[PDB]
């Protein structure tokens, strides 16, 4: 007539559970998932580095690549440029723009990598696309003018 326990009141865990990440924690490799610019993005989005030091390491890494002879990274370089490009607009960094641009270019000048400069002309990756500003209505046109793949 009497019974104790076996009532089942406490739930066991309740939900999925396993290892986290398991991708790259310790050494493993560099870069989380694609995009070599994501790192710079990390510092700009984190307390790591300022939008300048971060973008600096981004272009710097791009310099290492630009040191190599591989181009899979040259269009991807343009992409990195595209990485801090948009971020800067949201990060309010105008000087950093003409800086990475005049710096990466002045660099292509000192050395070769004119091919990188080529896609730059084909991508409008030169001068302050808007108008040496931080908030305008102008588009890539300006850049398209600095180095256009058409006209004379």
Determine the 3-state secondary structure of 36 from DSSP. Answer: coil
How far does Cα 13 stand from its chain's mean position?
Answer: 40
Domains along the chain with CATH numbers: 1-152 (1.25.40.240)
C-alpha to C-alpha distance for 13 and 21, rounded to whole angstroms: 21
- What are the structure tokens assigned to 34, written together? 């694609």
3-state secondary structure of 120: helix
Is the alpha carbon torsion for 129, 95, 42, 111 positive or negative? positive
- Paired tokens of 28: 């493993």
Contact 99, 58 (CB under 8 A): no
The token pair that represents 37 in the structure block: 């610019």
Give the position of tokens 């990060």.
91
């Amino acid at each position: 007539m009497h019974h104790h326990h076996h009532h089942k009141l406490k739930t066991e865990q309740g939900g999925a559970h396993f290892s986290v990440s398991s991708l790259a924690e310790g050494s493993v490799t560099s870069v989380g998932s694609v995009n070599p610019a994501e790192n710079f993005r990390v510092l700009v989005k984190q307390k790591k580095a300022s939008f300048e030091e971060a973008s600096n390491q981004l272009i710097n890494h791009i310099e290492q690549f630009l040191d190599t002879n591989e181009t899979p990274y040259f269009m991807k370089s343009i992409d990195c440029i595209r990485a801090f490009r948009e971020e800067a607009i949201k990060f309010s960094e105008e000087q950093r723009f003409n800086n990475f641009l005049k710096a990466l270019q002045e660099k292509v000048e000192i050395k070769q990598l004119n091919h990188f400069w080529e896609i730059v002309v084909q991508d409008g990756i030169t001068l302050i696309t808007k108008e040496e500003a931080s908030g305008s209505s102008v588009t890539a046109e300006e850049a398209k003018k600095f180095l256009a793949p058409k006209d004379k």
